[PDB]
Amino acid sequence: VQLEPNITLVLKHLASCGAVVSAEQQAALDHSIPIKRIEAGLRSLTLWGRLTTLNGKDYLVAEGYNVASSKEGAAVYETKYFYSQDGARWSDLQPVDSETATRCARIKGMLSGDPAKNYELELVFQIPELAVLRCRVDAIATATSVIPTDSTILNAASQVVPNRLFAGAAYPEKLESYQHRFSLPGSGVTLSQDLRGTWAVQYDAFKGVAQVRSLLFPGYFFYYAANELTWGSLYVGDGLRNNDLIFML
Amino acid sequence: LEKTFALIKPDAVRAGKAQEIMQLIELNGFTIIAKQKLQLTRARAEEFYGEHKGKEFFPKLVNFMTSGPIWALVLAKPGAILAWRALMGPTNVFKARAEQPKCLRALYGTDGTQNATHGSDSPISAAREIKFFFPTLSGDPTIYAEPTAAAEYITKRIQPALAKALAALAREKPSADKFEAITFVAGYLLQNNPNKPKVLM
Amino acid sequence: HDTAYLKETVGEALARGCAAAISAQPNDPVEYLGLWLLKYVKNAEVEGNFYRERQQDLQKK
Amino acid sequence: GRTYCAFSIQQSSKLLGTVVLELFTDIAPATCANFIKYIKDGYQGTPLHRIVPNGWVQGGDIVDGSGKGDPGFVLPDETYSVKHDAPGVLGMATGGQPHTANTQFYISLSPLPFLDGKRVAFGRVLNKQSLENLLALQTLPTFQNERPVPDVVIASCHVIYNP
Amino acid sequence: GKNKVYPLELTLEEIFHGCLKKVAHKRKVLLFSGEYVEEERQLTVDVKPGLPTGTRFVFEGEGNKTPKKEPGPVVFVLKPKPHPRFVRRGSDLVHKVTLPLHHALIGTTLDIRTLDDRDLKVPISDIMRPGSSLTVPGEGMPLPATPSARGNLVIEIDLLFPTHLTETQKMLLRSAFFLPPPTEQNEETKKALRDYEAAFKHDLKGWATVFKR
């Protein structure tokens, strides 16, 4: 039914889970999301998340794509990520090559504010902080991008497009009603096929709203309201990974 | 059901009245077959206004038409050409205001040359201009599909290059399979042809 | 003789190419015809591929 | 996956050798079909007519056996795709003007660049023993004006490995 | 075997998108008259997206016609007009931006308007070295072979050092360039830094944000 999640509805439904942004930053977002959506050629630019930092200048990260195709048995989106400290002026996040993509996953810690920070590894490897930020965003998006099943569909020329006749998911408390965004529409892959204890679902059946929380990445929340058929997802907190899931559960 | 060409000039686009013009066009029964916003260059406008070659008003006409972006539209209706001439009204805005006060020239035009719209005159000119701005828009399956005209078309343009290609193929005689010969003749046609040059780097 | 070879090798597709080139009225009919022949062979192979993929998906389901 | 056919060469009741050939039934099908139909019914006693030292071993006339044309059929020109660049390239021969090919066939004995695009080549020798048999057939004791003085004859000919 | 070579000037936008040029030729046919007679032919040249500079388009059968020899071909050599922003270097563009020193050290975002109608804001990811550069992948000219992939935009950085510095500014710079690591600082050092930061960012009498006169 919906074609792009709102920022206001998402920030309203996920407020209870701590997924909130400052009010001045909220107004700046309201003004400066369309500006970036028009400056860049994108046609769907939403807010992805907000990563914390050693300063107060958290990283607000937005994501936008033009084309979304079906390549090699996977729905692939040519995503582009932007970051900002305040909601006013956005900058871009260039992708990182594989050598850095492997040398950036060993840098556990909380990111600092200035995006001109260099971490050191071992000879010494000097890595920029924006590379680490992009690595963390890519990992979280690979592990957590959640949408209701059958919300997308395949057309001619093999483009994944919103299912304009989507009638919602029956049993919105079962994990079988949600799927990764990069699963092809025909495939029966859902969040159930992931590790059993990774995802937690709390479903308010009276107000008809379901919340899916990631336990492997503790700061990722997703909401799905069935009566109005609106689904959104945000990530608040840093992008570190919960390795010892077996002990916590 | 016929169709005509019509462009909104830069004066009605600089004043932000393009959308209202489209709405009025649609309210009167027209159907916008295809639209495109585009800025002509000097050469393209001079080729566009070929009929009034060496006229007295040509300098200012070509200088105005390339001052800003314009809109190009194809409008479809049973009486599209005459209906668009009537709706578009008299060609002179000062005459238009006196004669027909509720017409596009009177409402949005300001000057003899800044009439804010341009339409076609006759079906031949309309088809020519639609082909000029929309090379891929189909149309006119009656005059083009005509045994005498079709034979003339093949003989005059396609036949001179094809005869040489079929000769070279008969000389070479490639593998008896279809695909190799088809690829060979297609590559030959795309390699040496009269109108296009050969690209080297 | 050679005319039979030319006929049963190219004529069937060349006639369709000529009809297509004369219906559309392009600006460069020769280049249009050449690109048409390339797309002709390409669409044959890709329609075979499409049939194969559809059958495979049905079987997997 | 092609077809194969073999025949023997004998000079004056003395077995001179045997040769096996692969036929390009995927490049020039009709020429191979005619060649196999004639090796099944024909070529059984047809002399080796023309023998050029560093050129080709020619022969295979039917109604005359001595190098003049035959009636009953004319073979059209199929394809110039196989290029004469290595020894042992079997092909058909015709007059200067195309579309007059007959049972006359020829096997190359050296790279022959000029023949490319003038003669239908539709086969090859398979091994080194056959090629050496032809190369030995070059230096016969005496051959008069490009014909062996005794009759170098195809004694036997058969088809193996395929329908 | 003489040929007439003509430059063909294109803008970077045309080569990026793929133009379709109509050029004019003044061709001379020699006759019995003392002077020649010439005519203007029109030639349609179709430049493909991102063709390399120096591409030759040869029109065979076009050129001055002597009485005996069939005229030789006419050659058009593709060259790009100068651009205010970009200069192409093979398959990717080059942008030479003059950078302030504090933008180099502290870091800012360069603003670049691409050939396509999209704006671009690229952060400075570290201390930009003198004569160093930055690379934005997928933001160059298209590949002539494949009509989808492109090069990578290259920003060549030329720092713009300040022309004047006072002695107190130099004192502040030396204190910034020799500050001890945060695990080596005294409590007096931390208190002094906090006081100075609260004074420099004072909302009414601090100079952290001023309005240009």
PDB file of C-alpha atoms in Angstrom, chain B residues 60-146:
ATOM      1  CA  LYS B  60      14.645  38.007 -33.522  1.00  0.00           C
ATOM      2  CA  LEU B  61      12.534  34.853 -33.910  1.00  0.00           C
ATOM      3  CA  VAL B  62      15.534  32.541 -33.583  1.00  0.00           C
ATOM      4  CA  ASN B  63      17.035  34.691 -30.816  1.00  0.00           C
ATOM      5  CA  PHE B  64      13.845  34.525 -28.736  1.00  0.00           C
ATOM      6  CA  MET B  65      13.210  30.803 -29.264  1.00  0.00           C
ATOM      7  CA  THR B  66      16.615  29.938 -27.742  1.00  0.00           C
ATOM      8  CA  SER B  67      16.415  32.254 -24.725  1.00  0.00           C
ATOM      9  CA  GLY B  68      14.995  29.630 -22.371  1.00  0.00           C
ATOM     10  CA  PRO B  69      13.542  26.132 -22.150  1.00  0.00           C
ATOM     11  CA  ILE B  70      10.312  25.377 -23.970  1.00  0.00           C
ATOM     12  CA  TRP B  71       7.743  22.588 -23.778  1.00  0.00           C
ATOM     13  CA  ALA B  72       6.967  20.320 -26.738  1.00  0.00           C
ATOM     14  CA  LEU B  73       3.661  18.453 -26.901  1.00  0.00           C
ATOM     15  CA  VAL B  74       1.678  16.202 -29.224  1.00  0.00           C
ATOM     16  CA  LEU B  75      -2.082  16.698 -28.923  1.00  0.00           C
ATOM     17  CA  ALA B  76      -4.573  14.116 -30.176  1.00  0.00           C
ATOM     18  CA  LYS B  77      -8.196  14.753 -31.159  1.00  0.00           C
ATOM     19  CA  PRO B  78     -10.513  14.013 -34.118  1.00  0.00           C
ATOM     20  CA  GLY B  79     -10.089  17.614 -35.298  1.00  0.00           C
ATOM     21  CA  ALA B  80      -6.799  18.282 -33.561  1.00  0.00           C
ATOM     22  CA  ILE B  81      -5.203  20.707 -36.033  1.00  0.00           C
ATOM     23  CA  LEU B  82      -8.166  23.019 -36.621  1.00  0.00           C
ATOM     24  CA  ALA B  83      -9.275  22.775 -32.988  1.00  0.00           C
ATOM     25  CA  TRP B  84      -5.806  23.756 -31.781  1.00  0.00           C
ATOM     26  CA  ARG B  85      -5.703  26.663 -34.235  1.00  0.00           C
ATOM     27  CA  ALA B  86      -9.085  27.864 -32.953  1.00  0.00           C
ATOM     28  CA  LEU B  87      -8.200  27.451 -29.268  1.00  0.00           C
ATOM     29  CA  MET B  88      -4.783  29.016 -29.838  1.00  0.00           C
ATOM     30  CA  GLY B  89      -6.635  31.885 -31.501  1.00  0.00           C
ATOM     31  CA  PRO B  90      -5.424  34.667 -33.786  1.00  0.00           C
ATOM     32  CA  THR B  91      -1.700  34.908 -34.396  1.00  0.00           C
ATOM     33  CA  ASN B  92      -1.361  38.529 -33.204  1.00  0.00           C
ATOM     34  CA  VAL B  93      -1.864  39.196 -29.500  1.00  0.00           C
ATOM     35  CA  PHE B  94      -3.029  42.797 -29.965  1.00  0.00           C
ATOM     36  CA  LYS B  95      -5.515  41.611 -32.580  1.00  0.00           C
ATOM     37  CA  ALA B  96      -6.360  38.625 -30.365  1.00  0.00           C
ATOM     38  CA  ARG B  97      -7.407  40.717 -27.358  1.00  0.00           C
ATOM     39  CA  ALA B  98      -9.870  42.706 -29.464  1.00  0.00           C
ATOM     40  CA  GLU B  99     -11.148  39.744 -31.481  1.00  0.00           C
ATOM     41  CA  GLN B 100     -11.107  36.812 -29.025  1.00  0.00           C
ATOM     42  CA  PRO B 101     -10.435  37.977 -25.453  1.00  0.00           C
ATOM     43  CA  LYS B 102     -10.597  34.476 -23.943  1.00  0.00           C
ATOM     44  CA  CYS B 103      -7.817  32.839 -25.978  1.00  0.00           C
ATOM     45  CA  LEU B 104      -4.327  31.635 -25.117  1.00  0.00           C
ATOM     46  CA  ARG B 105      -2.699  34.534 -26.989  1.00  0.00           C
ATOM     47  CA  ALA B 106      -4.830  37.117 -25.191  1.00  0.00           C
ATOM     48  CA  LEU B 107      -4.390  35.444 -21.803  1.00  0.00           C
ATOM     49  CA  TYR B 108      -0.641  34.729 -21.959  1.00  0.00           C
ATOM     50  CA  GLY B 109       0.788  36.493 -25.009  1.00  0.00           C
ATOM     51  CA  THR B 110       2.500  39.866 -24.760  1.00  0.00           C
ATOM     52  CA  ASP B 111       3.928  40.773 -28.180  1.00  0.00           C
ATOM     53  CA  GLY B 112       3.697  40.018 -31.883  1.00  0.00           C
ATOM     54  CA  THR B 113       6.540  37.507 -31.670  1.00  0.00           C
ATOM     55  CA  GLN B 114       6.022  36.492 -28.014  1.00  0.00           C
ATOM     56  CA  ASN B 115       2.692  34.810 -28.708  1.00  0.00           C
ATOM     57  CA  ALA B 116       3.550  32.225 -26.008  1.00  0.00           C
ATOM     58  CA  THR B 117       2.518  29.222 -28.138  1.00  0.00           C
ATOM     59  CA  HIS B 118       3.328  27.647 -31.491  1.00  0.00           C
ATOM     60  CA  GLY B 119       1.146  25.253 -33.465  1.00  0.00           C
ATOM     61  CA  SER B 120       1.259  23.435 -36.776  1.00  0.00           C
ATOM     62  CA  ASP B 121      -0.458  24.550 -39.980  1.00  0.00           C
ATOM     63  CA  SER B 122      -1.200  21.512 -42.152  1.00  0.00           C
ATOM     64  CA  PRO B 123      -1.045  17.726 -41.639  1.00  0.00           C
ATOM     65  CA  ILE B 124       2.193  17.433 -43.638  1.00  0.00           C
ATOM     66  CA  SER B 125       3.890  20.085 -41.497  1.00  0.00           C
ATOM     67  CA  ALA B 126       2.456  18.532 -38.333  1.00  0.00           C
ATOM     68  CA  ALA B 127       3.794  15.069 -39.173  1.00  0.00           C
ATOM     69  CA  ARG B 128       7.150  16.546 -40.187  1.00  0.00           C
ATOM     70  CA  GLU B 129       7.478  18.416 -36.913  1.00  0.00           C
ATOM     71  CA  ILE B 130       6.353  15.505 -34.730  1.00  0.00           C
ATOM     72  CA  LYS B 131       9.063  13.471 -36.450  1.00  0.00           C
ATOM     73  CA  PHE B 132      11.479  16.351 -35.811  1.00  0.00           C
ATOM     74  CA  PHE B 133      11.009  16.424 -32.026  1.00  0.00           C
ATOM     75  CA  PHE B 134       9.806  12.837 -31.386  1.00  0.00           C
ATOM     76  CA  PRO B 135      11.805  10.591 -33.742  1.00  0.00           C
ATOM     77  CA  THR B 136      10.473   7.415 -32.103  1.00  0.00           C
ATOM     78  CA  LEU B 137       6.780   8.346 -31.887  1.00  0.00           C
ATOM     79  CA  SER B 138       4.847   6.082 -34.245  1.00  0.00           C
ATOM     80  CA  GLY B 139       2.174   7.361 -36.590  1.00  0.00           C
ATOM     81  CA  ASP B 140       0.842   7.678 -40.134  1.00  0.00           C
ATOM     82  CA  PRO B 141       0.543   4.021 -41.225  1.00  0.00           C
ATOM     83  CA  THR B 142      -1.317   4.955 -44.436  1.00  0.00           C
ATOM     84  CA  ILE B 143       0.945   7.268 -46.468  1.00  0.00           C
ATOM     85  CA  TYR B 144       4.131   5.390 -45.527  1.00  0.00           C
ATOM     86  CA  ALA B 145       2.636   1.915 -46.062  1.00  0.00           C
ATOM     87  CA  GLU B 146       1.818   2.321 -49.755  1.00  0.00           C
TER      88      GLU B 146
END
